[PDB]
Amino acid sequence: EDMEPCLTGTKVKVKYGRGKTQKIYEASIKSTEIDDGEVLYLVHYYGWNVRYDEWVKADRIIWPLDKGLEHHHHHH
């Protein structure tokens, strides 16, 4: 029993900056929700905290879209 999750399989680039905790990570989308008017994503850091993960807004995400992006044989 399943349902289609919120755009899973998509690895994106995520920024998160607060104080010293400023990184730009590669993460996979787990789920997406609308939390108080805005859409927040629950992203899964690839190589980091694998249980709780983190919530970031669309603003802090770099979506795969051609900005001069490679599409030959990594992810066509």
UniProtKB/Swiss-Prot annotation:
**Compartments reported by the entry:** Nucleus
Q: Give TM regions.
A: none
Segments forming domain Tudor-knot: 9-61
What subunit structure does UniProt give? Identified in mSin3A corepressor complexes together with SIN3A, SIN3B, RBBP4, RBBP7, SAP30, BRMS1, HDAC1 and HDAC2. Interacts with BRMS1. Interacts with RB1. Interacts with ARID4B. Interacts with AR.
Query: Domain text from the record?
Result: The function of the Tudor-knot domain, also named chromodomain-like, is uncertain. One study suggests that it mediates binding to lysine-methylated histone tails, with strongest affinity for H4K20me3 and H3K36me3. However, another study failed to find any interaction between this domain and histone H4K20me3 peptide.
Question: What job does the chain carry out?
Answer: DNA-binding protein which modulates activity of several transcription factors including RB1 (retinoblastoma-associated protein) and AR (androgen receptor). May function as part of an mSin3A repressor complex. Has no intrinsic transcriptional activity. Plays a role in the regulation of epigenetic modifications at the PWS/AS imprinting center near the SNRPN promoter, where it might function as part of a complex with RB1 and ARID4B.
What is the name attached to this protein's record? AT-rich interactive domain-containing protein 4A
Q: Which organism is it from?
A: Homo sapiens (Human)
Source taxonomy lineage? Eukaryota, Metazoa, Chordata, Craniata, Vertebrata
